Known about the structure:
- The first copy, chain A, is an alpha/beta fold.
- The two termini of chain A are 15 Å apart.
- Chain A contains six helices and seven strands, in the order βαβαββαβαβαβα.
- The radius of gyration of chain A is 14 Å and the shape is globular.
- Chain C: This is Molybdenum cofactor carrier protein.
- Chain C: InterPro entries: LDcluster4, LOG_family_nucleotidases.
Amino acid sequence: KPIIGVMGPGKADTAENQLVMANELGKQIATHGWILLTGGRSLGVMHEAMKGAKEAGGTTIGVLPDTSEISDAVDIPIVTGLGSARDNINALSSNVLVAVGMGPGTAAEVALALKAKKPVVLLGTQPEAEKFFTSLDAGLVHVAADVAGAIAAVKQLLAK
Amino acid sequence: RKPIIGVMGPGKADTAENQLVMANELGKQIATHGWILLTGGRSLGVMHEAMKGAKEAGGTTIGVLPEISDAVDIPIVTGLGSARDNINALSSNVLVAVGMGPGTAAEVALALKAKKPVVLLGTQPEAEKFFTSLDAGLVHVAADVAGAIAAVKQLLAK
Amino acid sequence: RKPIIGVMGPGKADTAENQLVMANELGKQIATHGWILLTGGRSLGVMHEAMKGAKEAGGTTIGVLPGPSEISDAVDIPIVTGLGSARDNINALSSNVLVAVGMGPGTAAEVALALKAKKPVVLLGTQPEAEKFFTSLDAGLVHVAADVAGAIAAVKQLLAK
Amino acid sequence: RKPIIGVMGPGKADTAENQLVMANELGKQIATHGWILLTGGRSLGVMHEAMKGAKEAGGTTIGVLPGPDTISDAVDIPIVTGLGARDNINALSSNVLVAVGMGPGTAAEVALALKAKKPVVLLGTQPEAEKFFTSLDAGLVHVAADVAGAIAAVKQLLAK
């Protein structure tokens, strides 16, 4: 059962178009028979992908700093306690990683995945980010224009 | 959402034979009761047995790692090694220690520190009575797999 | 290289005043022996007193923290980690010898972790059940000290080997 | 409290030789200013030269390692973490961070420092990096053209 990780900025930092892409990304992850792994508290991109995944009957793993609540969009809550430190659990536990948008948090998570030699697809990050991460590891970086392209890169990659 | 039962225990070299038997059937019963099993993948004593108990009974297992192992449905790779995945303690609704050693002691203590109940099974007096001195209200001592599955059912309901 | 001695204690209403006084004196004796004190870096309880005692004797101190902020004023070197309820095996792995003053859930995790790292732990001001329970984890690494002088003498011997 | 300056760079042959000289001269100037050098505690790359540099000029050094561990001779205080993972320690413990060169590990440390809202001095990085990280946080990113520049950016940042 493949595991696809979604990173992306939080609620305040995610633009409306990026939110829409994130939901659609989560749906398509679910319809291709994959598990979604993302951050279980963050309310921008990561939440939208989880809702997307859930709305289309997919399994979601949320990674979390118990404490209250959760979200009902999370199926398997994995609580680390690690506060501001590295749940590079995403990076390491995923088959493929997709970033929707960009910010300091997300840049950090993408660079760890590359360091760990795992492929990353970059959706809706700007040219600045696309060129830098490609400059880090051109064999591991895939830029996608929209969700369907991102999902195609994810399919091509899992065959390998 | 399914209850998640954390199991902790020593590895191959320090797990007596009766503890492996107890671990294997504890996992069977975790699954049989419709709970998710959470434990370490890759530890080849108590923890590896509970996962198989659980799989053999058609349960869902999560394995925390720092390949493995047919019996793990969801691998969570942490990347730490000689550190703390406190994932077991904080992710799981109830924790069952089967046997005892340094690793397991640290994890029982962290669970009590996060104020979760722990069921101690096949641990011995010194461990039972020390953990009880830490938080008596959170520490439950079971005699056999049955008394431990029992204590777990009686804890999810509260 | 200067030896580093790790000190671990319980908290605050898990702390009695004999333990605060013993932690201060332990921390002085550590600094007087030319050793670095490594402990938790909050201005609270047993770890804080060890730190004030080391500073008072002209010792060097390292405080480990999670997060952000308010470092004890006795901390020379603050090590800020970003982990919350997550360990924080820094004390255990970085110290040559570790000393527990009192006992609580947190110190018990810390002590068990250090034994698993094959590091010697000196127990000071704990109850027979802790003493007995850790002794049963590893007889070879657990030193029960009766007072601060005994603690210091166990560290001394452990470093001389 | 003596200030702590953290240095980050690449390891093996993500590392050009002039980077190795800049790192060593930088460590040397950090120690001459009465500052502590915090770095990765290994015997390789930018971080080791910076350490050797600091020592040679009478400075104190802190080396952060994973598990378990012994570690350069230039390290006074070893901080052994056992998080084989993320030492987020540099980012959060240093007053100022200086990156010498760039690679995946460095990229994550820098983004984490900017996520923690700490200023980063970028020495000997390519303009893709200078541009990307400036795109993340203009206010926190300082491109130095050389070791003297890098020090006068620290010195001033330590003064605000």
